[PDB]
Amino acid sequence: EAETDRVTGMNKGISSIPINLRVYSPHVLNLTLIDLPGITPPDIEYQIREMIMQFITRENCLILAVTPANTDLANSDALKLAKEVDPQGLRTIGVITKLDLMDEGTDARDVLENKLLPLRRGYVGVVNRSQKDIDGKKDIKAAMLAERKFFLSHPAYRHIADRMGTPHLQKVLNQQLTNHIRDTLPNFRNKLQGQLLSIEHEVEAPTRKTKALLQMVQQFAVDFEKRIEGSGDQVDTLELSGGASINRIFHERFPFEIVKMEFNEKELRREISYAI
Amino acid sequence: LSGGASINRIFHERFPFEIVKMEFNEKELRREISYAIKNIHGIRTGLFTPDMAFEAIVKKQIVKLKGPSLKSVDLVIQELINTVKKCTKKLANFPRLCEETERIVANHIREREGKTKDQVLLLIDIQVSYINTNHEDFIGFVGNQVIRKGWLTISNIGIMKGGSKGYWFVLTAESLSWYKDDEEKEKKYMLPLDNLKVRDVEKSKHIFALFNTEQRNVYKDYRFLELACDSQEDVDSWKASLLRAGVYPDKSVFSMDPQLERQVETIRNLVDSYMSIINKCIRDLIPKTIMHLMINNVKDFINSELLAQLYSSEDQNTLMEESAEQAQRRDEMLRMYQALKEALGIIGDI
Amino acid sequence: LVDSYMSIINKCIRDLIPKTIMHLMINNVKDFINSELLAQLYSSEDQNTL
């Protein structure tokens, strides 16, 4: 909260500057995730979407799409943005929350079974059956047990219980991320090294001032001739050249400047008549 | 759909369409030109019209083909890398081999990626360096074979008195027909491609429409035919396919003395004309370049160098080693065999 | 049929090879003379002697 407020001017706005928190625990597997602003200034909705797109439009970015089961899954904001950048659903992993909150007599079996809104990486269900200890603080062991019981006792999900719940999700993410890195480690190192050596040629580049002067002045000279005469190549299309403006002075301004100073008929006639 | 057939679609349907899509914004372009002719002249005067202003504008346009052309190479790289991954599912039973094979081939692709892109760029650079005026096509002074088949939803039909149905559409160089299903046993209609154009309907569904420029209704009593797809890439693919069939998408979006307007009008016709010549060449030429430098090369590589690479990288003793999943099934089958033979051997029909 | 296709190829090639010669040689030689030439002359022989 403090680091966020430190950066964000208004206490409700967003920022692209990331916060990098690493947690070591016996309750977690080796896994990394980038949490982003949830979908919902006045243009905040667009700011959030724009931020999300910066991340998810990248090919190597895997999408963990979270949607609540007690809603219209076809209208899931997460699934909709995921379909926008990953139409083939090949880099999107679905997560279904709030399964215990579904309307009586309904269930998300068809989605959990990867049949309704098919994704190659599949769907995983979870439930937050919050348990508090004596002190009133989060009790994860009891919570994870309540979730296990829920899937095992649900007639629609019992057959899938071993592929549902919090512990399982971490394993899948751990596996897929590892495989994703293995696939990307050869191509990433090459694409970066190629763009790297090109920069090295520029970084490495007394004796150099004299040669620079000559080149700099000559550059200046051709630039000047270019504006003032329209010599090749391709001149300019955005702004009027020097020589062209001068041309306007010569053949539009000067004539007009003369005419404006020119003797008027009445004052011309009196002067001459006086002379005769 | 196969990999190689898709490549043909990339070359002769996608690439053209990607090109067509980059809007000229001509009104702002014409301004650029008029500014350009005044700048070549400038400090000099009048007749005749700046030869170099024409060249100036064209070189701008040709440079703009680097984007859609490089993208094309990637779209080919995508289908190529997809295909090696498809083929190697038949070798999945050997984890270290499929891995190492994928590795070496994927590697080779990225090496070829450089060289093909370089040549693609260079080819376009060559085009800007010299702008030939002696081309015969420059200076004034098909088959009914199926182009594409797919399911589409007609959204245009009224919510009342009509309905919504999915049809199996068949597009050819002459018509666009739709059937009840992919068996093509019942043809509901066949619509001629003559004088047809394409417009995109305003924004979970993506719709687009065909309309006849020369008459009111394009099919039957319905003004225009609205077609929809569940994904955005699909409508972009269909629009590209129609382009191949010759139905283009409709374009829709002074103080100066009369002599300049004439001067701008002449050069404008020239730029449009020359680009036509260039576009034709490049649409033809970039595929051939990709074909030769990437597709044909990778193909030949796999046949000859791949086996050699596999041998050098590691001993044949190591890479054909592990196969636990096959072994687990076979171990189950091996125990299966000894058991089933004894089982039936004791039992009898009696 | 062959005559037709060759016509198509010839037109592209007749058009394109000058462009290639232009870009790889003429434009290259030109650019060399303007920038690299003087430096090479300086590097080559003593300015007093040449």
- Decide: B218 and B225 in contact? Cβ < 8 Å: yes
Residue A47: how many CA atoms within 13 Å on its side-chain side? 10
- Decide: A48 and A14 in contact? Cβ < 8 Å: yes
SS3 A23: coil
Alpha-carbon gap, residue A125 to A159, rounded angstroms:
13
Supply A50's token pair: 């724009």
Q: What does the longest C-alpha to C-alpha distance in chain C come to?
A: 68
First to last CA, chain B: 56
Q: Which residue of A has its CA nearest to B36?
A: A237
Query: What are the residues facing B206 on neighbouring strands?
Result: B229
Alpha-carbon gap, residue A44 to A50, rounded angstroms:
10
Angle among Cα B144, B249, B159 to the nearest 5 degrees reads: 90
Q: What is the CATH number of the domain that holds B8?
A: 1.20.120.1240
CA B56 to chain CA centroid, nearest Å: 30
Looking at the structure, tell me whether residues B34 and B16 fall in a common domain. yes
For chains A and B, CB pairs below 8 A equal 86
Alpha-carbon gap, residue B41 to A247, rounded angstroms:
9
Q: Do C15 and B132 touch (CB under 8 A)?
A: yes
All residues of chain C having their beta carbon less than 8 Å from the beta carbon of residue A211 are: 39
All residues of chain C having their beta carbon less than 8 Å from the beta carbon of residue A214 are: 38
Residue whose entry in the numeric block shows the structure tokens 């009586």: A104
Q: Which residue of A has its CA nearest to B204?
A: A80
Alpha-carbon gap, residue B66 to B60, rounded angstroms:
11
Q: Which residue of C has its CA nearest to B283?
A: C12
Q: Which residue of B has its CA nearest to A242?
A: B42
Q: Do B130 and C12 touch (CB under 8 A)?
A: no
Alpha-carbon gap, residue A247 to A238, rounded angstroms:
18
Q: Do A244 and B56 touch (CB under 8 A)?
A: no
Looking at the structure, tell me whether residues B2 and B120 fall in a common domain. yes
Instruction: For residue A84, give every residue at least 6 positions away whose Cβ sits within 8 Å of its Cβ, in sequence order, or none.
Output: B232
Residue A272: how many CA atoms within 13 Å on its side-chain side? 7
Burial A182-208 (b: 16+ CB within 10 A, else e): eeeeebeeeeeeeeeeeeeeeeeeeee
- The candidate with the shortest Cα–Cα distance to B168, out of B181, B186, B154, is B181
SS3 A187: helix
- The candidate with the shortest Cα–Cα distance to B169, out of B242, B249, B223, B218, is B242
- The candidate with the shortest Cα–Cα distance to B32, out of B2, B5, B57, is B57
Q: Do C39 and A211 touch (CB under 8 A)?
A: yes
Torsion of CA B42, B43, B47, B50, to 10 degrees: -40
CB count within 10 Å of CB B58 equals 20
For chains B and C, CB pairs below 8 A equal 28
- Continuous segment of H or E residues that includes residue B241: helix B232-245
Alpha-carbon gap, residue A226 to B39, rounded angstroms:
9
Q: Nearest 5°: phi and psi at A273? A: -55, -40
Alpha-carbon gap, residue B162 to B156, rounded angstroms:
9
Alpha-carbon gap, residue A213 to A202, rounded angstroms:
19
Binding-site residues of A, please?
Answer: 97-103, 128-131
DSSP code of residue B45: -
Residue whose entry in the numeric block shows the structure tokens 């751990």: A174
- Decide: B239 and B11 in contact? Cβ < 8 Å: no
- Decide: B155 and B228 in contact? Cβ < 8 Å: yes
Give me the domain span that covers residue B177: 142-250
- Decide: A157 and A151 in contact? Cβ < 8 Å: yes
All residues of chain C having their beta carbon less than 8 Å from the beta carbon of residue B126 are: 16, 19-20, 22-24
Min Cα distance A275 → chain B (Å) is 43
SS3 A201: helix
- Decide: A55 and A61 in contact? Cβ < 8 Å: yes
Looking at the structure, tell me whether residues B174 and B310 fall in a common domain. no
Min Cα distance C18 → chain B (Å) is 8
- The candidate with the shortest Cα–Cα distance to B109, out of A185, A180, A187, is A187
All residues of chain B having their beta carbon less than 8 Å from the beta carbon of residue C20 are: 126
Q: Give one DSSP letter per residue of B81-135, joined into a string.
A: HHHHHHHTTTTTTSHHHHHHHHHHHHHHHHHHHHHHHHHHHHHHHHHHH---S--
Alpha-carbon gap, residue B338 to B166, rounded angstroms:
55
Q: Which long-range contacts (CB under 8 A, 24 or more apart) does A39-42 make?
A: A39/A77, A39/A78, A39/A81, A41/A10, A41/A13
Alpha-carbon gap, residue C16 to C10, rounded angstroms:
10
CB count within 10 Å of CB B335 equals 10
Residue B31: how many CA atoms within 13 Å on its side-chain side? 10
Min Cα distance C2 → chain A (Å) is 41
CA A79 to chain CA centroid, nearest Å: 17
Probe site for chain B from C5, C7, C9, C16 (most B CB atoms < 10 A): C16
Q: Do C18 and B135 touch (CB under 8 A)?
A: no
Residue A270: how many CA atoms within 13 Å on its side-chain side? 5
DSSP code of residue A74: G
- Decide: B57 and B266 in contact? Cβ < 8 Å: no
Exp. method: X-ray
SS3 B191: strand
- Decide: B243 and B249 in contact? Cβ < 8 Å: yes
CA distances from A44 to A26, A37, A51, A67 (A): 38, 10, 10, 21
Q: Nearest 5°: phi and psi at B177? A: -110, 150
Alpha-carbon gap, residue B57 to B269, rounded angstroms:
12
Min Cα distance A220 → chain C (Å) is 14
- Decide: B278 and B64 in contact? Cβ < 8 Å: no
Q: Which of B32, B59, B233 sits opposite A87 (nearest CB)?
A: B233
Q: Do B285 and C12 touch (CB under 8 A)?
A: yes
Pairing of strands A123-125, A92-97: parallel
- The candidate with the shortest Cα–Cα distance to A240, out of A230, A253, A225, is A230
Q: Nearest 5°: phi and psi at A27? A: -90, -5
CB count within 10 Å of CB B271 equals 20
Q: Which residue of A has its CA nearest to B29?
A: A237
Query: What are the residues facing B152 on neighbouring strands?
Result: B167
Signed CA dihedral, B178, B180, B182, B186: sign only: negative
Instruction: For residue B180, give every residue at least 6 positions away whose Cβ sits within 8 Å of its Cβ, in sequence order, or none.
Output: B167, B168, B186, B188
Alpha-carbon gap, residue A172 to A175, rounded angstroms:
5
All residues of chain A having their beta carbon less than 8 Å from the beta carbon of residue B40 are: 230, 235
Alpha-carbon gap, residue A65 to A189, rounded angstroms:
28
Q: Do A215 and C38 touch (CB under 8 A)?
A: no
Residue A92: how many CA atoms within 13 Å on its side-chain side? 24
- The candidate with the shortest Cα–Cα distance to B21, out of B85, B74, B67, is B67
All residues of chain B having their beta carbon less than 8 Å from the beta carbon of residue A237 are: 32-33, 35-36, 39, 56-57, 60
Instruction: For residue B107, give every residue at least 6 positions away whose Cβ sits within 8 Å of its Cβ, in sequence order, or none.
Output: A186
Alpha-carbon gap, residue B3 to B79, rounded angstroms:
6
Helix ranges (DSSP H) in chain A: 2-7, 44-56, 77-85, 109-112, 140-153, 166-203, 207-229, 242-248, 254-261, 265-275
Alpha-carbon gap, residue A87 to A77, rounded angstroms:
14
Q: What is the CATH number of the domain that holds B174?
A: 2.30.29.30
Q: Give one DSSP letter per residue of A35-55, joined into a string.
A: --PPP--TTHHHHHHHHHHHH
Alpha-carbon gap, residue A272 to A206, rounded angstroms:
74
Alpha-carbon gap, residue B175 to A260, rounded angstroms:
70
Query: What are the residues facing A255 on neighbouring strands?
Result: none
Min Cα distance A57 → chain B (Å) is 14
Q: What is the resolution of this structure in A?
A: 3.7
DSSP code of residue A73: G
Alpha-carbon gap, residue B55 to B130, rounded angstroms:
9
CA distances from A237 to A191, B40, B60, B125 (A): 36, 10, 11, 21
CA distances from A68 to A83, A89, A93, A104, B199 (A): 17, 19, 14, 16, 37
- The candidate with the shortest Cα–Cα distance to B266, out of B47, B5, B19, is B47
Residue type, B280: K
- Continuous segment of H or E residues that includes residue C31: helix C27-31
Min Cα distance A153 → chain B (Å) is 33
Probe site for chain A from B31, B41, B43, B44 (most A CB atoms < 10 A): B43
Q: Do A211 and C35 touch (CB under 8 A)?
A: no
Q: Give one DSSP letter per residue of A106-155, joined into a string.
A: ---HHHHTTSSS--TT-EEE------B-TTS-B-HHHHHHHHHHHHHH-T
Signed CA dihedral, A112, A115, A117, A120: sign only: positive
Q: Give one DSSP letter per residue of B292-325, joined into a string.
A: IIIIHHHHHHHHHHHHHHHHHHS-HHHHT---HH
- The candidate with the shortest Cα–Cα distance to B310, out of B318, B298, B321, is B318
Alpha-carbon gap, residue A49 to A14, rounded angstroms:
11
- The candidate with the shortest Cα–Cα distance to A121, out of A183, A80, A163, is A163
- The candidate with the shortest Cα–Cα distance to B50, out of A233, C25, A99, is A233
- Continuous segment of H or E residues that includes residue B154: strand B148-154
- The candidate with the shortest Cα–Cα distance to A31, out of A234, A178, A186, is A178
Rg (CA), chain C: 20
CB count within 10 Å of CB B162 equals 11
Q: Is residue B217 less than 8 Å (CB to CB) from chain A?
A: no
Min Cα distance B60 → chain A (Å) is 9
SS3 B150: strand
Looking at the structure, tell me whether residues B224 and B109 fall in a common domain. no
Signed CA dihedral, B64, B67, B70, B75: sign only: negative
Rg (CA), chain B: 29
Q: Which residue of B has its CA nearest to A228?
A: B43
Alpha-carbon gap, residue A60 to A140, rounded angstroms:
32
In what order do the strands lie in the sheet containing A63-68? A63-68, A92-97, A123-125
